[PDB]
Amino acid sequence: MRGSTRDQNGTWEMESNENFEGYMKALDIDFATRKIAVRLTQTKVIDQDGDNFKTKTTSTFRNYDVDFTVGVEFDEYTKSLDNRHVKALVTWEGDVLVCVQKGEKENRGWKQWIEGDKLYLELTCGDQVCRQVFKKKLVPR
Ligand SMILES: CC1=C(/C=C/C(C)=C/C=C/C(C)=C/CO)C(C)(C)CCC1
Helix, strand or coil: CCCCCCCCCEEEEEEEEECHHHHHHHCCCCHHHHHHHCCCCCEEEEEEECCEEEEEEECCCCCEEEEEECCCCEEEECCCCCCCEEEEEEEEECCEEEEEEECCCCCCEEEEEEECCEEEEEEEECCEEEEEEEEEEECCC
């Protein structure tokens, strides 16, 4: 993948989500939670100023907020997901935002990037990859 810009500001609505089940299973998220969440449309709100990100992922079941500064390791406590601690580091690789979440689970992280007018997110854990695509709702520019 390749990002067309580093500016990820805006509100984005999920248009596809593939193998979210596999990803959730790899995180040991319980059956009942998986069944509720698997096909609920998510919305992502990204507030970005340079390297400083504030993000919200919302649905009619659960939300998940994570804020970070690119380059700076932080303690991500994954409440409402698997309730673990990971040492999260988000970096740019070209115009792809790459997160590695170091902790118990192997190969845990995500990659997020813009192509033209859509936002793409790939979530990984263990041997599972989930691919998501979000259409634009709002951008500042
Ligand atoms: C598993 C699971 C969820 C996971 C959301 C995730 C994994 C969000 C990741 C956000 C990161 C990648 C921010 C940058 O986009 C939500 C809360 C939807 C519903 C409850 C079950």
